[PDB]
Amino acid sequence: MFIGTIILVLSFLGFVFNRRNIILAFICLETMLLGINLILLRNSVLFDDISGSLFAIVIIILAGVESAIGLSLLVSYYRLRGV
Amino acid sequence: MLILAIISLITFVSMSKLSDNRAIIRLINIYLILVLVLDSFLYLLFLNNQTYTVMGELLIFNSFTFYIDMLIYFIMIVISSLYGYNLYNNNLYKTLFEPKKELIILFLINILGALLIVHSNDFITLFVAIELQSYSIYLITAIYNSSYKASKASMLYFFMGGILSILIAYSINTYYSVLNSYTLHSLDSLIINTLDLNLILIALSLGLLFKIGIAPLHKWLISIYENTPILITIYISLIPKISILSYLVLSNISINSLVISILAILTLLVGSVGGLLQIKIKRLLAFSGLTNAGYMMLLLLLNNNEFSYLYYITQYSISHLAIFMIIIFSIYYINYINNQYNPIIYVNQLKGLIHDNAYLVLSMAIVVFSFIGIPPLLGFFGKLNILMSILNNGYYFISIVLIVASLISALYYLYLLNVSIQDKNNILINSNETVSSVLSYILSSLIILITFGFIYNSLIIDIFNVYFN
Amino acid sequence: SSTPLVKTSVNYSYGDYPLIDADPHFKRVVGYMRPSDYGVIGLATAALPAGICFAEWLDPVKGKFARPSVKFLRVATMLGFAVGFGAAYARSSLRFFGVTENAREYKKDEAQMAARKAAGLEPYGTSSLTPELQEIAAKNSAHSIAGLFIFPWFNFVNHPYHGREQK
Amino acid sequence: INANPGFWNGPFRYLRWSAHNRPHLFFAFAIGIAGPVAALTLTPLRRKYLYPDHSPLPQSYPLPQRAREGLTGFDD
Amino acid sequence: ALFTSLVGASGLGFATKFLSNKIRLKPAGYYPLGYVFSGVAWAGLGLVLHNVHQHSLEVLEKKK
Amino acid sequence: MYLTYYFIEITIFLAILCTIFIISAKNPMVSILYMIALFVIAAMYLYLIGLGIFSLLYIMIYIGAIAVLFLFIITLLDINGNDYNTIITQDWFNIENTTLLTTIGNVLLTNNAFILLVLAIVLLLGIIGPISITMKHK
Amino acid sequence: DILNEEAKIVQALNNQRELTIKMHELKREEKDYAHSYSPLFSDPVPQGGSIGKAPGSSR
Amino acid sequence: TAAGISLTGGRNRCFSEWQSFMHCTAKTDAKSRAQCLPNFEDYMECLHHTKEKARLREIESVLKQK
């Protein structure tokens, strides 16, 4: 339970104190979506089911579509600026 | 019949040119009207709060949620009806308020996202649908791309939406880490006695709530609600409210919450005093949107509150909806327009609205009286029945801070009327064009609802008693 | 391939009228709807193009009273058939719930059930499924006429149990 | 030039027209439409004409429903 | 009484056209035919809503 | 064979090592270069915990699409006391290797098929959105 | 005549009060499983995941 | 749903403890759920084995003591 907690919490602390670099916010969020997995997946493992794995494959997919949508949001954020 | 609309219409928009964008939205307007009219009778699907669990313990259809399920179609008819109809036949109103190609698609995607929360039993369907509506509001903010405030607000909304994505997911993960369910039969007043599921369900509640403007997370939604264009905000300050609040009121997962009560107090206080020294109208309007959700936090605390919730919902989703459309009308009479995406900002700009007409002013006056609880209005009995639920279960200090919040609120709601009826020095005598008829007729309807809504006070109580119990 | 082996409510009504079924099969809903029901379909199909002609008569798009393209009329005809069919399925399958007026169909289901009892086959017909899948697919289609506002869902399953007296 | 007649003027002519000009759409679309339509219509015929289905495969040890009779043999 | 409810709902519709003209800066009687349409539609809701309430009351009477 | 025991406690610390290099990087691309290594350490942790399936699922989708997507964007800039061994039995009730992936394919398709059906609309939105933004039709 | 009218009115209001107080008791009444969840499938017994099932799991 | 499923799609570790709890609830109205508590606690020992860990650390402490 340690590793998913620590990836999530260090990603959270990385999100807070590192605003002004903006891509770093995305990738800390992406590792957050990994950390929720690393806790939930071993809960499926310890609890003898794939019901947590059922939620897990969905949150894999939703992390994906998050990276699909929000990066187009980024491209919109930089088209109207130059840099 | 949402999906049955969407799968046809995105093929239809892809096979369409750019000048059809009004007519597609006119089609969807009439479509949702006929969905409501021709299929209204499904309230007959219960008689004694008879609740269905559909798609196998996954969705939940009941006496309650059918109402919100109707309500979202009702408001979407209005929102669509803004787009599809011209305001005037002017050059100004076609370089303003012209919809994009993909916009009306994203609305029905969002309504799918909103309805699949309120009808959701499962946490997994909850999570899918909050991601769905979060992506919806991401795009619907970012769709009017050639505005710097629009894209900046889209990013701003994006990162807090990501935190609440992971926070709700961590709450679901923790609840699963102590229990092998995801549904909510597993509470049933027995595990609550013998297991500390307080903090976990509290952390579920907070993560669901902080997509509203709940006062620890306060400034950022307000910065959005001004940096958006004036059109998109009348949609996105409504749907994420009433979707998840109907979820949270449907399942009272935090009863006697120490956390939610203190946050409700702080919400009402800082929203009421945040409405004070402000001259930007989108701000002022968003803080009204905050304090009314402040009342929502109060209705989250109670047990068995399906009256005061739904009645205050149909209060709020009419009044809060209509005051936008009033100031959408009001920008024709003003003397200075900037900012093609967002024409009015400063509340000073509608200085002489009564010497333009009396009747848009009177219609504005009664709806701004409707936010402050003026007793012959529909906006009153919301607060009345809130307080009939509050002292029902002894939230005493909550009631007196509600009174403080109501007074400090009603100070700044009248600031609109302080502006609106004054001298202008340059009065209209003759406009060439009129306002497009049925677009304004919708506002006439929405305002006779608020004024003459105490008529059906009795019949709605009878429908409440028979159907919802 | 016909044992339900789950505990199902028996004759548990939904209104004041006697039920027939908890989810009527999709071929059956076509097979039992009233002749006044088909008028709801037809008037819904007429409502959409008359609706658009209406809506442009109220406020035109570009200030001129002009009838829209035939493309819009064909697509409005399609969605009018969608609304009419949703209304038809919705108005029809209530009568299996015993929640609206159940007069002729309770007679017809004392006939066709008795028609296939004497014909010796299953009271609903064999599906191409293991019975556990029959259970789970009917759990999907159970009460799914509710939430017709969100999505259409139907019963294509032909599973055994229906909230009947015993079979 | 092969611009457009429109699908909603004459259908079958437009189908021929797309087959002469854009077979990348229409011969993906024909393979696509031949899937579920044949899936609907052919499967009653195969059970009627060709051959019926298979017996379902057991998924666990199949349990009958009996009452634990007296079964002798192999006491000692 | 059903008819007395209908009169009030059609009066609400009369007020709808009456208000809508005054935002359109038209006179009181500008497009009179619209008062018929609003006179029906809102009254139609009073058709429906009272038909709801009839159907409500009997259900309570069947629980005694 | 006592070096075998601390395997998991290897990759935890190597995770903790890696995340510090995420939030301490000069260039933007140096950060995602550490992040793909964090995905790989994660996948090795999934192989080591006993889910060899999802280890490779993540390599298909995390450092498959979404990481390479991040790389592809960031190119486009102008100018820079629970110590108890659990006991595992052996039962003979299973008959065929319906693995984890099979039963995902059963629960996603029978018990909770509506989730996959709405997931179609989520994947629809992933198509529409970038075309909703980055196009400027006509 | 006026006292008869007020007898009717006050009895109507007491009918109203004893309507509503009962309806409040009708709210807080313990609901059965048939009304609360799905009407058919009257048991809450899950019995799910039946492929690798083991004889003896019911209790 | 994915209620009593397993890795191989069978039944999990505590299906019985779950179902004996659900048998405990299907025959029992509220204000009589107190008797359902030992059926519930038997479920919880499945999930986290807190009574088992408390059982084992004591005997491990005794084994350390001698």
Domain span at residue A3?
A: 1-83
Alpha-carbon span F48 to F41, nearest angstrom? 10
Residue B258 parent element (H or E): helix B258-274
Beta strands in D1-76 (DSSP E): none
Token output for B29: 């307007």
Residue of H1, H5, H6, H7 to mutate for F, most F C-beta atoms under 10 A: H7
Half-sphere exposure (Cβ direction) of H56: Cα atoms closer than 13 Å: 11
What's the N-to-C CA distance of chain E in angstroms? 25
Question: If you search the block for the tokens 């120490």, which residue do you land on?
Answer: B258
Main-chain dihedrals φ then ψ at residue C36, nearest 5 degrees: -70, -20
Distance separating alpha carbons of residues B333 and A67, to the nearest angstrom: 44
Token duo for residue G11: 């009895």
What secondary structure letter does DSSP report for H35?
A: G
- B51, B52, B465 member nearest G23 (Cβ): B465
On the 0-12 / 13-18 / 19+ scale of CB atoms within 10 A, B421 is middle
- Alpha-carbon distance of H32 to H28, in angstroms, equals 7
d(CA D4, CA B17): 15
Cα distance from G22 to chain H (closest Cα, Å)?
A: 21
How far, in Å, CA of B401 to CA of B408, rounded? Answer: 10
* C-alpha span between B26 and C48 (Å, rounded): 11
F91 neighbourhood in chain G, CB within 8 Å = 54
Do B245 and B293 meet the contact criterion of CB atoms below 8 Å apart? yes
Whether B446 and B321 have beta carbons less than 8 Å apart is answered as yes
Q: Residue A7 is nearest to which of F19, F65, F130, comparing CB atoms? A: F19
Q: What b/e string do you get for F84-114 counting C-beta neighbours within 10 Å, with b at 16 or more?
A: eeeeeeeeeebeeebebebbbebbbebbbbb
Q: Do chains H and G touch (3 or more CB pairs under 8 A)?
A: yes
Going from N- to C-terminal start, the domains of chain C cover 1-167
B 179-198 → A contacts, CB under 8 A:
180, 182
Distance CA A32, CA B447 (A): 47
Specify whether the CB–CB gap between H6 and G48 falls below 8 A: no
Closest-CA residue to B166 (of B122, B121, B197, B211): B211
Method: cryo-EM
Token representation of residue B323: 């005051």
Q: Give the length of chain G.
A: 59
Instruction: Return the SS3 of C112.
Output: helix
- Is-contact C91 C37, C-beta < 8 A? yes
Q: E strand or H helix at B191, and its extent?
A: helix B191-194
Alpha-carbon distance of A53 to A59, in angstroms, equals 9
According to DSSP, residue B212 is labeled: T
Judge contact between F103 and H6, C-beta under 8 A: yes
* Letter string b/e over residues B342-362, b meaning 16 or more CB atoms within 10 A of that residue's CB: bbbbebebbbbbbbbbebbbe
Contacts of C150 (CB under 8 A, 6+ apart): B1, B2, B3, B69, B112, B115, B116, B119
Residue B467: how many other CB atoms lie within 10 Å: 21
Check if the beta carbon of residue B48 is closer than 8 Å to that of residue B61: no
Q: How far apart are CA F52 and CA B344, in angstroms?
A: 59
G50 min Cα distance to partner chain F (Å): 11
CB B183: neighbour CB atoms within 10 A?
A: 17
Residue B52: beta bridge partners? B61
Chain H residues whose beta carbon lies within 8 Å of the beta carbon of residue A43: none
Residue B275, CA atoms < 13 Å, CB-side half-sphere: 26
Give residue for tokens 């340690």.
A2
3-state secondary structure of B59: strand
Question: Which residue in chain B is spatially nearest to G23 when comparing CA positions?
Answer: B465
Query: Using an 8 Å Cβ cutoff, are C88 and C40 in contact?
Result: yes
Q: Chain D residues with CB inside 8 Å of C132's CB? A: 59
User: Residue C89 corresponds to which tokens in the numbers above?
Assistant: 């399925």
Dihedral Cα B255, B256, B257, B258, nearest 10 deg: -170
B184 CB neighbour count, 10 Å cutoff: 15
Which subunits count as partners of chain B given 3+ CB pairs below 8 Å? Answer: A, C, E, F, G, H
Please state, in angstroms and rounded to a whole number, the distance separating the CA atoms of residues B69 and B114: 9
How far is it, in rounded angstroms, from Cα B308 to Cα G40?
31
Domain total in chain A: 1
Q: B9, B30 in Cβ contact below 8 A?
A: no
| Nearest alpha carbon to residue B289 among B221, B343, B243 | B221
Contact B244, B313 (CB under 8 A): no
Number of domains in chain B: 1
Helix axes B281-301, B258-274, angle to 10 degrees: 160
Q: Which chains touch G (3 or more CB pairs under 8 A)?
A: B, C, D, F, H
Name the nearest CA neighbour of F105 among B278, A53, B66. A53
Rounded Cα distance between C161 and C138, Å, is 9
B22: Cα within 13 Å, side-chain hemisphere:
20
Interfacial residues of G (vs C; Cβ cutoff 8 Å): 34, 38-43, 45, 47, 50
Closest CA to B205 of B277, B318, B301, B330: B301
| Chain-chain contact of B173 with A36 (C-beta, under 8 angstroms) | yes
Contact between C145 and C89 under an 8 Å Cβ cutoff? The reply is: yes
Burial class (CB in 10 A: 0-12, 13-18, 19+), H11: buried
Asked if residues B299 and B386 have their Cβ atoms less than 8 Å apart, the reply is yes
A61 in Cβ contact with B130 (< 8 Å) = no
- Which one of B49, B53, B469 has the shortest CB-CB distance to G23? B469
User: Mutating which of B50, B51, B122, B252 best tests the G interface, going by the most G Cβ atoms within 10 A?
Assistant: B51
- Name the nearest CA neighbour of B291 among B383, B168, B414, B397: B383
- What is the residue range of B301's domain? 1-469
Beta bridge mates, B61: B52
Nearest to G42 among C9, C139, C142 (CB): C9
E18, two tokens:
């009456």
CA distances from E53 to B52, B66, B460, B463, E59 (A): 24, 18, 9, 7, 10
How far apart CA B317 and CA H18 sit, in angstroms, is 43
Cβ–Cβ under 8 Å, residues H25 and G44: yes
Q: What are the C-alpha distances in Å from B21 to residues B83, B84, B85, B340, H61?
A: 9, 8, 11, 19, 77
For residue B56, give the nearest of C157, H1, C12, A56 by alpha carbon.
H1
Residue type, E35: Y
Q: Which amino acid is at A3?
A: I
What gap in Å lies between CA B133 and CA B136, rounded to an integer? 5
Q: How many helices (H) and strands (E) does chain H have?
A: 3, 0
Give the distance from CA B201 to its chain's centroid. 24
Cα–Cα distance measured from residue E11 to residue E41, given in angstroms and rounded to the nearest whole number: 11
The residue among A60, A45, B172, A53 whose CA lies nearest residue F45 is A45
